[PDB]
Design a protein around this ligand. Structure first.
Ligand SMILES: COc1ccc2nc(NC(=O)[C@H](CC3CCCC3)c3ccc(S(=O)(=O)N4CCN(C)CC4)cc3)sc2n1
Ligand SMILES: OC[C@H]1O[C@H](O)[C@H](O)[C@@H](O)[C@@H]1O
Ligand code: NA
Length: 447
């Protein structure tokens, strides 16, 4: 409105502790709703049972394959477990073409199967039939540890014939059509789950997995008596919260800003994954772009004139946000970004662009922290210890590559979780290694 000022505009992103506690308590309410049989179907946070349990008592050595499929690339990993346990891995990255991102799920899996076939050829692992763990970074309703149907794509990925289908069967069918090799798919897990398992290997206190990358989600070990969707009260079972859909029932309405509505309105999945849209690297850069456009329309930035690039959706990558915030103080990192976008920025413009990035990324960290606090505080209600010692495994480009996200996030989480001694583990290739590690236990369990 009238009298607009840079600080006043960027201040809209602030979230006071009372705001974070309110977000946190609402997340806990939605988590309870997704866990109970009565409200599950209408719950925004699905709390999907993963069928990964705490009870198996043994594992085994051997060679295990891992497939890790996200929204743009995928990697194959060969994990060798030997002997105390010794774990050695090899891997290869692949990128899904175009006659895929728009094509059928069958086309997608055929390409993935061709890639796995080539990987095994190159490592002379064709003769031996290997077990494969599958990390699939999308919402899946599991029927067992190796059976789940895709509920819906997220993060703007698409491929017809996938939603409503058993993802494992899709991979199995494709491996079949290739017919030049055998492979047993022994488990399919979400990337949050694989990440928690890869960290659990190194630290058994790890019972929470989290991802802050293209998307944002979390899994944690819940008491079986609380998982109403699976008969039994013995032990714990990992639950994939799919908390990115938090707010999809209106729970965040009072916090949403115009920039958030615009990002949602123009996204590939309007009205869905609203919490994730406040945090995820898929949306962070676009949020900063809308904020910068607002500043120029108010004649507070670039003397009111934006460039063609700046005015096209997706032009401000989250990678750019991270680079802006890494600036040493001389504006070179910032200038390198703006100049490449067709802008002739002043030193002041650069400083304004940095404060805008900080406003958006700080809000992401704070929103994300209320979610994690909600998970950790809930868990603490099932332990008799005064101080709960818990380890959170985390993966994701925002958490790992953004200059100061990690620290803001950690600090905010800690302020909201008294009586909890939290250790954060930044996972290295966990999404992929966790799938292989769970396969060894699943293979041993199946004798
Ligand atoms: C076969 O069908 C089924 C059914 C249920 C099930 N649950 C499983 N659970 C596991 O594999 C559990 C899940 C953990 C999450 C936190 C609590 C325990 C698991 C336990 C231990 C690890 S591990 O410590 O990473 N590790 C893997 C490598 N081997 C050589 C040593 C042990 C990895 C996974 S496998 C399985 N298979
Ligand atoms: O990859 C991070 C996350 O992205 C989205 O939120 C997906 O829906 C979820 O499954 C995943 O875990
Ligand atoms: Na149960």
């Amino acid at each position: 409105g009238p009298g607009s000022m840079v600080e006043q505009i960027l201040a809209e992103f602030q979230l006071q502790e009372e705001d974070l506690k309110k977000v946190m308590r609402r997340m806990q309410k939605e988590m309870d709703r997704g866990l109970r049989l009565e409200t599950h179907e209408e719950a925004s946070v699905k709390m999907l049972p993963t069928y990964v349990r705490s009870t198996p008592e043994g594992s085994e050595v051997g060679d295990f394959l891992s497939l890790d499929l996200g929204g743009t690339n995928f990697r194959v990993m060969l994990v060798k477990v030997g002997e105390q346990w010794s774990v050695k891995t090899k891997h290869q990255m692949y990128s899904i073409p175009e006659d895929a991102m728009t094509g059928t799920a069958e086309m997608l899996f055929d390409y993935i199967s061709e890639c796995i076939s080539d990987f095994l050829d190159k490592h002379q692992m064709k003769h031996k039939k290997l077990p494969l763990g599958f990390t699939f970074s999308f919402p899946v309703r599991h029927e067992d540890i190796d059976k789940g149907i895709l509920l819906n794509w997220t993060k703007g990925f698409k491929a017809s014939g996938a939603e409503g289908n058993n993802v494992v069967g899709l991979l199995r069918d494709a491996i079949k059509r290739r017919g030049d090799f055998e492979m047993d798919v022994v488990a399919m897990v979400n990337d949050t789950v694989a990440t928690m398992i890869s960290c659990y290997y190194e630290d058994h206190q790890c019972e929470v997995g989290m991802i802050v990358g293209t998307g944002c989600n979390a899994c944690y070990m819940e008491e079986m008596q609380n998982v109403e969707l699976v008969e039994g009260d013995e032990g714990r079972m990992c639950v994939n919260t799919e908390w990115g859909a938090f707010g999809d029932s209106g729970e965040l309405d009072e916090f949403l800003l115009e920039y958030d509505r615009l990002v949602d309105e123009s996204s590939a999945n309007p009205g869905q994954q609203l919490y994730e849209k406040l945090i995820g690297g898929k949306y962070m850069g676009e949020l900063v772009r809308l904020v910068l456009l607002r500043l120029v329309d108010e004649n507070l930035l670039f003397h009111g004139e934006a460039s063609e690039q700046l005015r096209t959706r997706g032009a401000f990558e989250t990678r750019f946000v991270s680079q802006v915030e890494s600036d040493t103080g001389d504006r070179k990192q910032i200038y390198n970004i703006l100049s490449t976008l067709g802008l002739r920025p002043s030193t002041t413009d650069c400083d304004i662009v940095r404060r805008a990035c900080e406003s958006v990324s700080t809000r992401a960290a704070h929103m994300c922290s209320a979610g994690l606090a909600g998970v950790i505080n809930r868990m603490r209600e099932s332990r008799s210890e005064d101080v709960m010692r818990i380890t959170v495994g985390v993966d994701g480009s925002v958490y790992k590559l953004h200059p100061s996200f990690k620290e803001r996030f950690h600090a905010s989480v800690r302020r909201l979780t008294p009586s909890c001694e939290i250790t954060f583990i930044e996972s290295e290739e966990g999404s992929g290694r966790g799938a292989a590690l769970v396969s060894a236990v699943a293979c041993k369990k199946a004798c």
